[PDB]
Amino acid sequence: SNMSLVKETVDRLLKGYDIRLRPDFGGPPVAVGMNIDIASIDMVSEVNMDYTLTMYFQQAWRDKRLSYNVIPLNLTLDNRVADQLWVPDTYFLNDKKSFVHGVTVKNRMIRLHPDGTVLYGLRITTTAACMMDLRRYPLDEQNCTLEIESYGYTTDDIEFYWRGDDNAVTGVTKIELPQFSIVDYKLITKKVVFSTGSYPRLSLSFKLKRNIGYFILQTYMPSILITILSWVSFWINYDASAARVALGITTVLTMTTINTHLRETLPKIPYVKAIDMYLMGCFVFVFMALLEYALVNYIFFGDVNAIDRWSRIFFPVVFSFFNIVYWLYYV
Amino acid sequence: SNMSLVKETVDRLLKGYDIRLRPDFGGPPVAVGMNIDIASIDMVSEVNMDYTLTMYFQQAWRDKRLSYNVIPLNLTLDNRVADQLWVPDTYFLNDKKSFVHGVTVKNRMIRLHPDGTVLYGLRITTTAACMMDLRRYPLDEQNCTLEIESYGYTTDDIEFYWRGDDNAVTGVTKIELPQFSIVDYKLITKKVVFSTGSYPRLSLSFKLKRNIGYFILQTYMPSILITILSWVSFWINYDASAARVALGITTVLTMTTINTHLRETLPKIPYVKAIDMYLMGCFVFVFMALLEYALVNYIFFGTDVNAIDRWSRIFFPVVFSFFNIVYWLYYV
Amino acid sequence: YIVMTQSPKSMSMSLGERVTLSCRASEYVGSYVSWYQQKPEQSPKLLIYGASNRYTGVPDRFAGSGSATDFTLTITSVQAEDLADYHCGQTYNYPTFGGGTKLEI
Amino acid sequence: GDVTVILNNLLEGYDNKLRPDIGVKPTLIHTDMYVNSIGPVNAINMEYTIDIFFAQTWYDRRLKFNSTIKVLRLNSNMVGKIWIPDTFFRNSKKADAHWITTPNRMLRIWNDGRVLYTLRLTIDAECQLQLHNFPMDEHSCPLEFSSYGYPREEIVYQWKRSSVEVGDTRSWRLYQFSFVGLRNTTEVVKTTSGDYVVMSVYFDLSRRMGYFTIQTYIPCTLIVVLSWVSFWINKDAVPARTSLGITTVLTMTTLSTIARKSLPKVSYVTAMDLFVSVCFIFVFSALVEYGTLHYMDSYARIFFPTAFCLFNLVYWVS
Amino acid sequence: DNTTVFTRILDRLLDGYDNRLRPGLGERVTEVKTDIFVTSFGPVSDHDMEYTIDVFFRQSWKDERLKFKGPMTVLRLNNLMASKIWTPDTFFHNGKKSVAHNMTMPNKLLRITEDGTLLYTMRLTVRAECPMHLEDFPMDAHACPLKFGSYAYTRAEVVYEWTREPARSVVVAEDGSRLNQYDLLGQTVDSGIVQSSTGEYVVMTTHFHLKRKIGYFVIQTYLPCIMTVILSQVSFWLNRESVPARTVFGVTTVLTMTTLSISARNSLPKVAYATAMDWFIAVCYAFVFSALIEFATVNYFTKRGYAWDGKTFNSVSKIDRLSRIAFPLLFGIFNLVYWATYLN
Amino acid sequence: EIQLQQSGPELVKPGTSVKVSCKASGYSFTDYNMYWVKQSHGKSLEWIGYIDPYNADTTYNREFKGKATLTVDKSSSTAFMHLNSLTSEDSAVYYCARKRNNFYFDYWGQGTPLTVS
Amino acid sequence: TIFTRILDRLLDGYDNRLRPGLGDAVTEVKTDIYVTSFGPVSDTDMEYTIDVFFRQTWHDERLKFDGPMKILPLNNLLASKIWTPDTFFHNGKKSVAHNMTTPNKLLRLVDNGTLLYTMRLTIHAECPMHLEDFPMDVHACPLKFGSYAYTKAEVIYSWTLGKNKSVEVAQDGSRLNQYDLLGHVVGTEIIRSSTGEYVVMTTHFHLKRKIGYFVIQTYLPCIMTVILSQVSFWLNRESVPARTVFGVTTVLTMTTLSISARNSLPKVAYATAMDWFIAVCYAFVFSALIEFATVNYFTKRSWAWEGKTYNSVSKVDKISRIIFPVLFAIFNLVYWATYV
Ligand SMILES: CCCCCCCC(=O)OC[C@H](COP(=O)(O)O[C@@H]1[C@H](O)[C@H](O)[C@@H](OP(=O)(O)O)[C@H](OP(=O)(O)O)[C@H]1O)OC(=O)CCCCCCC
Ligand SMILES: CCCCCCCC(=O)OC[C@H](COP(=O)(O)O[C@@H]1[C@H](O)[C@H](O)[C@@H](OP(=O)(O)O)[C@H](OP(=O)(O)O)[C@H]1O)OC(=O)CCCCCCC
Ligand SMILES: CC(=O)[C@H]1CC[C@H]2[C@@H]3CC[C@H]4C[C@H](O)CC[C@]4(C)[C@H]3CC[C@]12C
Ligand SMILES: Cc1ccc(-c2nc3ccc(C)cn3c2CC(=O)N(C)C)cc1
Ligand SMILES: *[C@@H]1O[C@H](CO)[C@@H](O)[C@H](O)[C@H]1NC(C)=O
């Protein structure tokens, strides 16, 4: 009995329904309540300058055409009805390559409520552009934003709001990134003006902080050990040109390897990143460490022990002062 | 008024039009003409053994069912009308991956001429397969092709032919491949026989050549300079063991690393390439230079030794010089 | 073509007991070896289609086990009508039959 | 034909949008799965590829018929002509059904109304792993799946007696691990849209490690042995000891890089990273050892192997 | 109007036709005769443990419903008619991500004979799993299968077979061979059935027999291994006093050998078992490592730092002399054993 | 009830041509190929050729290529084998068979002994 | 419901296949672009990417209505129901029209008949490059488009605002890493082809590579490699192994630098400006090693100075300590002035 009754209801709603016109067409703006539940932030790609996000993006709005009262329950219909209803067109400005998942059937919830309300859930994987300045990298915190926005409807024709001021976005805490750590997230609602009109904008913004623990093991400690490996030259005898020069050259070449091994990881960025300001600082120290012998070779052949001794003490201190000055700037 | 008349004419053609049946079904084969305008042969990647080619592929065929007389102009219709029209099912037999360009709308052309001729253009980007003989590579002349062929219709149902003869394919000269240099293109009409029948075939064949100028900077000169670098040992006195030995093996390793790094770029193929031959040539001299010190030190600990070193000081540059002349004379 | 050879040209065994016929193939034949029975002055009768499967209407005593090249037909219990001349065909390529084993008490 | 008229009767007056017993009772689905192959475990991305024959069955009163025909075997053409329970795999990063030559799906309907809906899938799911005894690690990877839109009061999921028809492990592309076994669970998870019913199928996997020995550990052990050779070498040959010492640290960095390349971008120190780091200390200590001599060797040559051996056993214990 | 006769025929075929019912449902079993013309044997992907193959996949089956009597004995039709009639749901059991080609139009031909027989060919690029055992790698040969059968139809519903003799039903064009490291030998086909909980299904197995060409890994891997093996023993020829020279020789050799070991591994997916190369690389690792220990032994007895000049002087070490001959001989005998073992 | 009935026994002197007809009764004639098998007394079964009745295509054994010619008459559902240049070696028993699968020769003929003098 | 009757009135008896004024008159399509961001430039692949809102204003007399609203902002799906220009990008290698969550297409239908059809696109356009001054290069990448099927006698494209007004860039939107957008240039031409004469709307975006990456990546190691080599001139002559490892290591480094520099580049055969800097640095390390070979030649005692005759500093070496650094300095000055 109920199954037959439900068929009459659903058939009545979809009959004489115009997908072209929005709710209240030629009328007040239709208020669309946005709700998000982030399943996963797959990666933060510095090389491609974007991040990949998978979410249960849910839009809730009111349509009086899809209002029924005969049954005291909320119909949840198969996903394919969405192609027969008016869905608010909605694009992400940051999106570069995004899709709604397909297996086993297209992940797209529809549920018409008795009081005209319609929930429209979508499971979307989004590769959103995140331009991220790198002058403090790796000791950098980058915002990466997702900007929900209606495409064809101005604020005169549609209105976006977060369903819940700060509970509209859920699951952020459970997110895990191998390299980052989400310190904070914020939700903003704006109006962006284009030549065609002023449109409603919702910005979901994550403020992610780099994990220093990763880069200490990979870049800074090798840079230090190579830098310390430079200084052991200063304990070697003055008439050991084959050894100290061999130790100095490989130390200098290694830093070039490490620096080159790093920048290939990163994009062709024209800044001078904080890691570079450390590698360059190490570069000058190891290079000057090589010059310490070259100058000693020039005194003896062209005091020599004293030059070794003062260099032996200054190099640690001036590196420590460089290190303390480095972190204080980047703390 | 006039656009109303065009509507009635175009509606007349499409009503009762059976897309399943070719022009002159159960009759003489339809002769479709093909003219191409190449837009690029970018990404001639020997690693996947294919080249990606963007072209304005066009097909012109007669079709009595689409013949109109009232309109004197030639109706260019929206690209969506091709779905309601019969078009020749032509597949590129060597296409690992192809697509018709999508934005703004599907890039297709449909121009119905009054006589019944139909001009059906596409803008196709196809990663066509092109098996490459890499034995004189990089001084090699590759011959890539594109086999346009009807799939379902044998030569008793469809006929291919380049339209305009050798002028059918255009834009070949304007193409600039960073690594290659297109020297000649030849287009040939044939008929290929399969177990299902004898189908009409068109093979557009570009004969491309490589440029050594890129490869001297990247491949030869570093090897030549390393080869020259190894000979510096011959000007170093035998007593300097660590100096020449360190200079010796470092050159040997550098050749191997350049060899293995170069080979990593190329795919895994059984035959030996010319660059491998040059690398094999360079490796031998660098190896012999290491042996030259090996003999020198062995003899001394085993006046005359200096003479052995002196002749090697001059012959080793000379024998390398002769190798390059016969090498380049051989391959060039 | 593929040459089929039967190891026991003539096997002797009384009624009952186990009798196994062998049939090797010169090259690969897969599972396409068939077995046929031809009593004298009679046409061949199929017994074991495929390497193992038994044709419909054949008594269940007939069993055959096959491999890439080595094939066998075994009768668990021999009966008076069972004695005949058997043939092992191949069909993976153009047909070629075996020499033909014969049974008698 | 008998079959065609039955099918026309079933679909006529049928709604693909309304589930069986909508507004009457929850629709009970029993799911069975045939794990055809566990593809590669891409631990770099924390994802593994799995392909399955995913079977679902539900009693649809609308799709009941009475005739001599007990069941109706049908191709994929009928999948879209009836109500199919939406079932998305929650942890699937990107999943795809098979379509060549035709959609790899099937549909069987019995007289009583029982439907059987089986299709072939390929799923990239999510799986985590912890690196404290890496590579000597063990864990289990799940595969969740539930209705996307139908809450617990609209669709219910159960398992038939045949839990999971695991295939032959030899043909599996799981090279790193060995499929220890499977564990299956059903639960209810709350969400804003409702509280659904989830089906996590835990595949238990255990690592096997011979590849990593000759890639990192044995090469790492060897270069460590090279440093020990410095002590037998005369202290007069200053470049010889230095030429040997610099080689170890340089190679250690390269092995760290390729090991890091084979690893994800994880902040926590890995056991493999721990192994090279200890070797990094040994080679650095060996180089520093000679400097004092140039500025004892017998004691150095014995103590370091003892420390390495203890580290190896602790590595075994860990 | 001449084409109207053929359009009228096609309308009579499809009206009252059900795409869901197989030919002869219940009354008979459906027998599908399949052929393959491998237009190009795509590159075998050892890393993915799969292989690509580009085929014309012919299928033929008798359908009484699609029977006609007209001027043409056989109707050659485009793909558009194929989707409106029943076709086998053939899928490849070991088939990974596969693509049916679509440029320009869908590369499928339908051909209906007046008796009722159909020919339904399609052009495919099927990537199928080819499980591999790499104990003999690189000198290994594989028999990559391509199994295909119906998905929804059991053995009593539809049965497959080969149109020609089974030997002559998988044809490979001579021109098309896209393999680079592998080499195609021949194709062997077999039929069987597969046990499933859903039922018993018929399979059409075909094994493409491949063989690796050792030429690539000779120059790429074995020769650099041999040079490093050779390079190690050169330090025996160098005098014993030259401690930095031989030391730089030996330590360089091990590091180079280590790099080659890693280089070989990435060519192949991870596997618990060690291939033939891994044993060649391992024993090559022994000679290079053994050479260092030989030099280390000489350094033990290298009493005199000063060298010979043309007082005492260092004599050529007995171990050095014997290491001069034994090592190249010991490696040579190994190569004969190794190469004879796997090549034969 | 499938029954392949071949022609009666005959014997002709060398140099003459002989035709034997194989007639199919139960199953549809054109569906399955029809083979021809020769067996000398105390000898193995030898394949002559097969003819697909619908397309009338023929394939012949190399030894019997030219010696034997296969033709079919779909109207009567009869398969014909033609032999020429008869010799002592041609004296044998010629069977007719059908092929229902790639596996087996389902139903065979009654046999047609041939001898020369 | 009133607006539904309007739309149903418009689309009935409407041929979406036919041009506006097909045969009657030529169709003026007014175009405009808003570059939401200028995607990265693929120097290796010789192509850049751009993300644009692509407006297209054309007048259609069939779609004229008299109702309450003057403008009808309609759903993207109605775009397929009406005729639209078949614009394509002549130099577009690959492109996607975004449709997440739904087709990102705007379609407004003004009272008089005007239609504003706008959509979000991402075009991987092809930008031919001439890398002789690499990394001090400058490029002017085009962006051409026009009707695929309709000829210059059928469909004409014209900018709606003006030369520099009809192409705008979002100042926030700049996805270039190493390039720097300088400005945009706008022009209209007519390209001929076998199919016919078309109207093509070329727009050149002027870029400029930034050398900060290449100063860090290539030039500074090259300079330090050369400066490394010079150190051999100051090294003691009797130290034959030390100067030998120095020279061979540096040129070995240059070999890695020379190959690594080309790795970032495509496979052109131009011998770019970086190659010349690499080449001269290659000469300096080579000649620096040759300088040591000559110096070792005339060493006889090979006994190091200690406060039994020793070897004086080679006259070759003293001049090398001065000339070689200075020769590099004047070499550095001339080329840097040359590109600047
Ligand atoms: C792994 C552990 C190591 C095991 C290797 C164990 C082998 C081992 O380490 O001992 C070497 C020993 C002596 O050989 P070796 O030449 O190296 O040492 C000589 C020895 O010390 C003489 O006594 C010295 O003369 P003298 O009296 O002081 O005046 C002579 O110096 P000099 O005076 O002429 O200037 C030294 O050179 O035996 C062998 O002959 C080679 C055996 C075959 C070795 C072949 C094995 C492959
Ligand atoms: C690529 C450039 C290098 C190739 C150019 C090669 C140019 C070239 O061949 O130089 C020859 C000459 C070598 O002089 P050299 O460097 O050897 O310096 C001394 C000279 O040879 C004396 O003759 C030796 O003393 P003696 O009298 O024998 O007893 C003395 O030895 P010792 O007594 O102390 O023990 C030597 O140290 O140097 C120049 O004339 C200045 C050239 C400046 C060259 C600078 C040009 C840039
Ligand atoms: C006397 C003395 O201290 C000697 C010891 C080492 C010498 C430096 C080596 C590297 C050279 C590179 C460039 O060509 C400029 C000159 C340059 C910096 C040299 C200046 C003089 C130095 C410092
Ligand atoms: C729960 C369940 C059980 C079995 C199936 C199934 N249905 C088929 C039909 C055909 C083929 C080839 C394989 N099928 C398989 C998988 C199988 O049983 N294999 C590989 C031995 C699906 C779901
Ligand atoms: C089907 O027919 C049987 C026998 O008449 C009857 O018992 C059963 O109720 C019928 N089921 C229906 C009409 O659903």
Side-chain angles (χ1 to χ4, degrees), chain B residues 110-129:
Chain B
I110 284 284
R111 201 192 314 276
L112 278 44
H113 301 64
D115 60 357
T117 308
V118 171
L119 202 175
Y120 169 65
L122 295 177
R123 203 164 86 82
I124 293 159
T125 298
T126 164
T127 296

Side-chain angles (χ1 to χ4, degrees), chain D residues 32-34 36 53-55 106 118 162 165, chain E residues 91 93 149-152 194-199 201-203:
Chain D
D32 274 7
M33 182 156 47
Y34 189 102
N36 195 349
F53 301 79
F54 183 69
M106 67 97 79
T118 310
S162 54
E165 302 196 1
Chain E
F91 82 110
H93 296 7
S150 199
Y151 189 89
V194 66
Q195 294 297 132
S196 65
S197 174
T198 302
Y201 289 86
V202 54
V203 182

Side-chain angles (χ1 to χ4, degrees), chain F residues 48-72 74-88 90-104:
Chain F
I48 294 164
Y50 75 86
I51 178 163
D52 167 286
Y54 186 69
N55 266 265
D57 307 334
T58 63
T59 308
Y60 297 93
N61 186 287
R62 288 180 300 191
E63 158 54 15
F64 288 90
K65 167 57 197 70
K67 165 61 77 174
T69 289
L70 295 180
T71 59
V72 63
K74 293 171 261 58
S75 54
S76 301
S77 69
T78 48
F80 301 98
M81 181 188 68
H82 185 96
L83 292 164
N84 58 325
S85 68
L86 271 42
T87 73
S88 176
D90 288 6
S91 296
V93 196
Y94 291 94
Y95 286 102
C96 170
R98 55 168 240 187
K99 171 177 248 57
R100 210 212 86 75
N101 265 88
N102 308 135
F103 295 98
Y104 61 93

Side-chain angles (χ1 to χ4, degrees), chain G residues 246-308:
Chain G
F246 215 139
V248 303
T249 43
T250 51
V251 64
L252 161 58
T253 313
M254 279 305 319
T255 54
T256 59
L257 269 48
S258 175
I259 297 160
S260 70
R262 291 225 65 87
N263 170 31
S264 60
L265 278 168
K267 293 188 166 180
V268 298
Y270 298 142
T272 71
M274 184 134 68
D275 306 317
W276 283 114
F277 199 101
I278 290 156
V280 175
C281 291
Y282 220 135
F284 257 94
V285 299
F286 227 103
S287 301
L289 180 57
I290 293 163
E291 209 75 351
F292 165 62
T294 60
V295 172
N296 179 28
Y297 191 97
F298 306 93
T299 265
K300 54 190 76 174
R301 303 110 178 180
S302 189
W303 299 340
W305 183 287
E306 198 286 322
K308 196 66 230 178

Side-chain angles (χ1 to χ4, degrees), chain E residues 131-196:
Chain E
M132 312 190 178
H133 308 268
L134 314 172
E135 274 63 0
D136 315 333
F137 163 92
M139 297 155 286
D140 52 351
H142 297 123
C144 292
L146 183 79
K147 305 181 174 294
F148 62 94
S150 199
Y151 189 89
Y153 296 102
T154 54
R155 183 248 299 283
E157 288 288 349
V158 311
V159 304
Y160 290 91
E161 70 190 49
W162 308 98
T163 311
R164 265 177 299 285
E165 284 74 355
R168 330 187 97 77
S169 297
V170 172
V171 188
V172 185
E174 286 291 354
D175 304 7
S177 178
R178 297 182 186 175
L179 306 107
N180 306 345
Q181 59 270 30
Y182 281 91
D183 185 53
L184 182 63
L185 307 178
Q187 320 84 27
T188 60
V189 317
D190 188 4
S191 179
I193 66 103
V194 66
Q195 294 297 132
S196 65

